[PDB]
Amino acid sequence: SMEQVAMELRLTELTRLLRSVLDQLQDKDPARIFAQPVSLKEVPDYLDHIKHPMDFATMRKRLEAQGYKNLHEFEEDFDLIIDNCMKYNARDTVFYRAAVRLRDQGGVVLRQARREVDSIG
């Protein structure tokens, strides 16, 4: 149907905007701490602590399959990155501190993303 095509075009355009958001958030992680999944070879107990692991490569896979339907779903995954790290790692660690800085700097990007998503529809 034409309606299905129009819905698909909307999803494609959201995917474009989320890719730009993702790129901007990942720039706020210049140490690449959050770039890849925590390795279960190197941290073998991780899944005993963290039930829903997340990282930027994993988000990028979902994004490129058009697997985010709305900004809320995308933000859920970004918040998992931050929140998982702030539980597994202590306050005095470069990991925790990286997550705080990513959260604080990412807030700005996400605030305007929400306005754009709403504005453009």
Curated annotation (Swiss-Prot):
Domain Bromo: from-to ranges: 9-113
**Where's the Glycyl lysine isopeptide (Lys-Gly) (interchain with G-Cter in SUMO2) crosslink?**
K41
Tissue specificity annotation: Highly expressed in testis.
Subcellular location(s) per record: Nucleus; Chromosome
Coiled-coil ranges from the UniProt annotation: none
Function, as annotated? Scaffold subunit of various histone acetyltransferase (HAT) complexes, such as the MOZ/MORF and HBO1 complexes, that acts as a regulator of hematopoiesis. Plays a key role in HBO1 complex by directing KAT7/HBO1 specificity towards histone H3 'Lys-14' acetylation (H3K14ac), thereby promoting erythroid differentiation.
Q: How does it assemble?
A: Component of some HBO1 complex composed of KAT7/HBO1, MEAF6, ING4 and BRD1/BRPF2. Component of the MOZ/MORF complex composed at least of ING5, KAT6A, KAT6B, MEAF6 and one of BRPF1, BRD1/BRPF2 and BRPF3. Interacts (via PHD-type zinc finger domain) with unmodified histone H3. Interacts (via PWWP domain) with dimethylated and trimethylated 'Lys-79' on histone H3.
Q: What is this protein called?
A: Bromodomain-containing protein 1
Organism expressing this protein natively: Homo sapiens
In terms of the whole protein, what range is present?
Answer: 555 to 674 of 1058
